[PDB]
């Protein structure tokens, strides 16, 4: 999440890992929150964020088909 939002102009662009300390990630989450509230005031809308979150969510395997075991043999051929 931090890396993805960073890439959209919301903070210092970051390579963060699960190995990064929890304290560091939480501090970085807040600087993104700050930047988010600024772009909400600047745009006077939250639709831009809805689309950013939706996009980010589909990036993650637990929240997309990679954890759904898509297969195409037999009638599975039609829709996966």
């Amino acid at each position: 999440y931090l890396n993805f939002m960073s890439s959209k102009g919301l903070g210092i662009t970051t390579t963060y890992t699960a190995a990064t300390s929890q304290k560091t990630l939480n501090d970085a989450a807040f600087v993104i929150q700050t930047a988010i509230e600024q772009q909400i005031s600047l745009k006077k809308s939250t639709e831009w964020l809805r689309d950013a979150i939706d996009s980010f969510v589909k990036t993650q395997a637990n929240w997309n088909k990679q954890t759904e075991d898509e297969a195409f043999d037999g009638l599975q051929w039609l829709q996966g």
Partner: protein
Amino acid sequence: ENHNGYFVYIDASGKQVTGLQNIDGNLQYFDDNGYQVKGSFRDVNGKHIYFDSVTGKASSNVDIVNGK
């Protein structure tokens, strides 16, 4: 030189070597204690460089970075 199971490199100067180093045409790395890294990835500057498991020489590889 080998100390505690690890390769160190001591210069013509007589100084222990850390960091990324091209020694005699081969690209290698040593951590803070001066030990050499093999079969692992290291981050120097903007580069993600793998080093070989036998030689510790920089060559191509695939890393699972985050989830991918």
